[PDB]
Structures are given as C-alpha cells and as structure tokens.
C-alpha cells in the first residue's frame, strides 16, 4: 500500500520528526494492513517494499538499516510462543511507540552529555545531524563556557545552513572552508562529527568529508567525537579505505569538453576507521569502544 | 536524602566520611574493604519489608558516598557490584512470583519491549565473594604475566606506587631462567620516596636496578623494550587514572617509539562511569612541598597534581585475575560485573 | 612615474609574465630616469618606493622577494671597482635582460624537469602556478601517458578557471572537493603543488588549503612536490603552525549576527613544514633538501 510516496511526503517537515523514524512509522502502518498473523503473506510483502525503497533510494543506507532493525524486532517479538493476538497488538503499537522513544532518548542524552564540556573549550561541529545540534543547544541552555566553529560543506550548501541555524541562537561563529580545516589544530579543543550510519567495527558513514578530518585529528592528537541516537545500525563492513553502495559517480574522468556540461563527478559519501574515534555519544547509557558490534551480535545471533 | 533516617541504626557513615575527607584512610584496597564493612553493617542491622524501596535507599546511600568523596572509585565500584548481585536475584524471584527467550546473556530489545524470599543470605554471600576477590588478584595475573618478559630485554617502570605492580615484577624476577634490566623513573613531587623504596626492594631481590631521573628518559629509549603502568582506577573506554605523577609523558614517549604499554590493576578498580572530564576526577596536590618561603611565593604560583590521566590510545593490554584484556574489550567485563541501571545513581 | 601604475597596467594579459619579473622591470624603469650614478639620491628612494608598494599591497607576497633580489643584484654589481658609468649601463641593461631570462628558465624547466609523469602517473594538482601549467602543456606536446585530478580551489572560483585552461589542451579531467581528498589517495600516484613563496625554514607559503594535503601525503607516504620559478625566496620565518605576515584576518571570531553577513573569512593562506617536501623543481638545477636556505645564506653572506 505504497511507501515511496510516504517517503517523499517528508522533505520540508523534519526538525521535529526524523526521516528514518518516519520511514519506520510508514513500515509499521504498511504491516498493520496485510495481517501480521500470516507470516507468508506479510514478510514477503515487507521484503518487496524494502526492495522497492532501495530501488527508489539515491544516496542513503540508513533507511535500510532501520528497516532491517524493525524486521529483527518483529522476529524477536514472537519468542513468547503463546497466543498470536497479543503479540500482533504489541507489534501494531510499536510504530508510534518508536516515534515516542526518540524524545526520551534525546532527554537521556541531554543530561549525561552535558557533563563533557570543560572550561574554555572551542568546539568544531561537522555534518547535519539533529542530535549534535540538540546537544549544542542544550549545552547553551546549561550555561557552559563554549565556542562553535562552522565548516563549509558542499553537497547542496549544508555548512551555510548550519551556520544560519547557529546564528538564530546567539553564539559567535566563524566559517572555515574544508581545505582550510587542516591549519586549525591548537585553538579547537574537541572535534565533533555527526553520523548517518554506524557499522560493525565502529566505522562511520556520513557526508562530503570525515575520513580526512579523522586523519587530521589523529595527527594532532585531538579527540574525535561521534554523536548519534539509536537507529543507525548496519551489518556492513567496507572492503577498501572508502567503499559504499552508490547511485552517483565513483571517480569518473569526464570526456573532452569545451562548453562545460559534466565535471562535478567524484566521491560524495566517506567512511572513517575505528582507530580515529576516541569517544562515542549514544542514549544507551554510556558506551564507546566496540559496543556496536556486541549490539549487532545480540540482534542477529548469526 | 539526608542522614535523618540513619543515626542510631548506622553511625559509621560519619566516620567513613571523616576518613575520606582528611585522608586518614590510605590505599584503594583499604577504602574498598571499609565500604564492604559498611555494606555488611547496613545489611545486618536495618529493616526492609519492601525490595524496590530498599534498592532505592541503597542507591541514595551510594550517591551520598560519591558526593562525600569523588576520588574513591573502588568504594563506588564495590557498591555497584553489590547492586548488580542483588538485581539478578530480584529478577529471578520476580519470575517465580509471577508463576522468556534471549540470544545471548543480555539483550537490547528487552528494554524497548514491555516486561517473600531468602535474598538477604545471597546478598551477604555476595559481599563475602567480593572480599575474596579483593584478597587475591596477583595469583590470577601471574599465569599470564610471566610469559611476556624475555631474556636480555629491558623494562621501563613509571608509577611504583601500586602494591600489585611490584608483586607482579617480583614474581617475574623469581624465575632463574629469566633475566631482565630494570629502568625506574623517579617522579619528583609525589612519587620520589616510593620510587626509592621500590628501588631498594629490587636491590634486595638481587636484580640489576637502574635509578633514572625524570629528564633522562629520552637518552635510554633506544634500548627500552616494554612499558608497565602502576594505575589506580580503570574505566569504560580504556582510559585509566594512575597512582600519582610521571606517567603521561613516559606513555607518550612509548607511543612515539612504538614501545608496548602494559597495564596491571584488577576488576575491583574498574569503574562503569565514564571519565568525560580530566579536571573533574583528577585531584591536585600541595604547593608547600615544592618551594620554601611564603611572601615571595604569593607571586610564584606553583602548579602540582597528584593523580594522572592517560588516554586509551597509548595503552593496549589490561591483564587481570580473569585473563588478558584490551581497552576495546574491557567495557564488556564491566557490564558482566555492573548492571545497566546501576551506572547512574 | 610610479611602480603601482605599471603593475596595474598588466591585468588581462599575464600567463607568462612572471609578475615578479614585471615588478623588477618596473623597478628598473623607475631607476633609469633619476641618474643611478649617485647612491645617496637613489637607493634610499628605491627603498622608500618599495615600502610604499608594501603599504599599498592588497594580497601579494612575492613582490618583496623580487625587490630584495633586485637590491642584492645591485649590491653585487658595484664590487668590480672600475667606473660608475659602465656599471650603471650594465645595471640598466639587466632589467629587460632579466625579463628575457625568465622565458629561457621556463623553457629549461619544461624540457628537462618534466620526467616525473611518464608511466600513466595520476597527478593531484593544487595552487595555481604558470610553471606547472607550462610543464603540463609541454608534456602533452611531447606526448606521454598521463592523467589529471583537480582539487576544488575556492578564493573566488579559480578552480573553474583552472578547469577551463586544462580543457583548451585536450585531456580528461575530474573535480574533487577538498573534504573527500582523504578518501581518494589510492589511484592517484603523486601530489604536485604551485607555491606563492618559499620560506627561510624551507616550508611553503601557499593558498586556501595545502597543509592538510601535505599531512595526508605524509600519512599515505605518496610524495609531495612543489614546482616554482626560482625567485620566490623571501626573508620570512613562519615560527608556529598558524602564523604568517598576512593582509587578511588570521581566524577572526565574528560576533553573533542574524542576517548571515559575516561568514566567509576562512584562511586563504596556509603554511606547511620543511620535512614534507620530497622534490622542489627549479631552473637553477634540480635541488631540494636545504637548497633555498643555502641560497639565502649566499645572498646575505651570513
């Protein structure tokens, strides 16, 4: 009963919702039509829907991660081996319940995460993730000595947007180009990066440039930070230094031109290794080193 | 929660606080023992009727203790362990009272999905078990510890303040087939006397001892084989609080030269709380010991600290009583000893 | 008569006129009017003019280097202890002669020092220098397996200009953002750079982002190269990682604005350390390790 349309429906919304959360909700809604009782009629349909979504996907792995998590949850659900109605009801409940959860997670974050701020520490923020922004705003709320540094990101002018968002807060800020980020090593005390997908080992999928930043941090011995909630978990491991399922160009040397038509071709999404990250920020208590892998193991058991 | 409820039932809390504040109690082990004793006293004397309420009370007490002294991690840890011990039993009981599937020992989805007995004796036993664990750590290390050091290899030893590390060294030195040269860094404002004592002990043991000043670490680094830390407290991500002075720089040097950095402590020193700030947990020493006079020393503001914090990137090995572990793995060990809700009190 | 006016006179032409050579020519022209026989009336005036030029500078470094070189040359000239007329005449001749020399130097560079790219070595070019471009074009002329990778330069869209220049030569090119530069070091063999000036320490004075690139190169052990015409040796010492005599602001934290006005003030000039250089290509022989410093010593006799 459609899912692509639902996905499309969320573009100018957000800020209050959460794309992957929305997707999950949509999935749940789809599920509560074709009966969760008959497993043959339902699971296959769900799979088909997921395939369709993948086909319609441009540059996103997080939705897939969400859907597989949902599937896993569903599978777990039927372990009670009792009546087939209560379980169904629970499943039905668990969609808006997921939406509700996000708020609670945020709340949890905003009380433990505020302990990290030290006296006169300058913070650089990279990537458009809602969680990081929330953390920042709720740190301002707490009233702690802090500074904000903006990086000039170029997918569809994201850095500028981030800067603008920061402005409507009242915090003094300065914009730095992604090429010029290397020179800033002593002034910025902590390097903060948001994530779009957390892998097996603890590797991060995000945006236009993260790996380089990580490398720089390693070189300067400055702490590297990953800020996320709890829905972006993929059972994946990259083969090379940077490899992802992409709809865009993986390094394309364009043919001989004069009038300029196609030139903007290359890497858009980047992967960073486990060694670079020193601290991980999540709502599930406090966990850092290799907890994601453990979580995955718990989930899949395979 | 104030001390209005506990006045004639339990009095020793005040004494414990006093011990903490003016540093009458010394050595983390001793603190842990004291904590255990306190817990025992609480258990034997007080009344409960309800279980959840009792748990809450315990949590409150723990919080109060933390508020009284933050640098005493062992105290906290022991309490947490006890809580964990209680919790499992409580969970078991609930299942019988009411009258479940799990892929592993603990599940993540169980938090998302909606979920009189003789537990006192079990609780009592837990304390005893903890005490036993505290008693012997070195016996569970030496079977792994005396496998790493080889003939004609040179050791470098920062922090000789810890009682376990010395013992570990001694056990290695016992073996007739094994021979090694020991370089000892002093640590001026906090570790000097202790370092000297350690050196003396080494001499007594009949081993080749080399007393090295804090400046002469760089010249001997071409010959250095291994690095051992005398740490006091272990944490979640891997980072450790060391037993006072001259650890960080040495570790950095080791990292630079790609020298292996070992750590020996124990799981009772291991904490389920994160060290988010260095400034919050690390306590500073005394200015009086460094330089005489007072009137010109108003102008001369001297900076000196007790404890030292080392990042998890430099340290690779954490051998305990159970076995050899990593900073990327030790979190799980903590979880196996302290439960999920017991982290925040 | 003015030097500033002369400098202004060249705008749309360039692309072979080595700006410093033009400056030198202008200086010579200024000199050969008010009698170069007297040293009291002349050298001081020249110095004053140079000072004025420095004061008037918008965003240029090499002018100073040129002027000091000229001064040094002048000093060298009057050591023959012969006569005032002939020496003066020689000096006068040596202005246009110097300009003439530059072309010859360029030719030498383009014929001898082009052997680095031969066996289909993929080049990562950043920082616009005429010499590098000449080398490229004259390599195409010679016919050799070669491939180009372009990192996006953003002072006022110079990357686009560079791309256009490349186009008028016939060769497939691709655009890479300096954020995903850490992700792509695998297929690209060697890194080549055009510099604004070479420091006393050995390091390179360049553009919007080079230090990070250098760091990346160091990490990857793929060699870092600098190709410049040998007259960019200024008596300047960048002692710390984030310090240079710059006309623009060095990381200015702007106040809390609302209309998004003050943002684009990121570091447009960056410095890298002395150890990063593997080969420095100059017309005065193939010399790199501590050659610039030696040259400086020879010049100042100290």
Residue numbers in the entry:
A (entry chain B), C (entry chain A): 4 to 305
B (entry chain C): 10 to 108, 113 to 128, 147 to 376
Give the original sentences from the paper that presented this experimental model:
For multiple rounds of initiation to occur, the GDP on eIF2 has to be exchanged for GTP. This reaction is catalysed by a guanine nucleotide exchange factor (GEF) eIF2B. Here we have determined a cryoEM structure of eIF2B in complex with the GDP-bound form of eIF2 phosphorylated at Ser51 on the α subunit, which sheds light on the molecular interactions between the two molecules and provides a basis for understanding the regulation of translation by eIF2α phosphorylation. The structure consists of two eIF2 molecules bound to opposite sides of the eIF2B hetero-decamer.
To separate the different conformations adopted by eIF2 γ and β, we have applied two masked classifications. In two of these maps (B and D), we also observed in proximity to eIF2γ additional unknown low-resolution densities that could not be attributed to any region of eIF2 (extra density in map D). The extra density we found in map B would be in a similar location with respect to eIF2γ as eIF2B ε-cat HEAT domain in the structures obtained in57,58, suggesting the possibility of nucleotide exchange on the opposite side of eIF2B hetero-decamer in yeast.
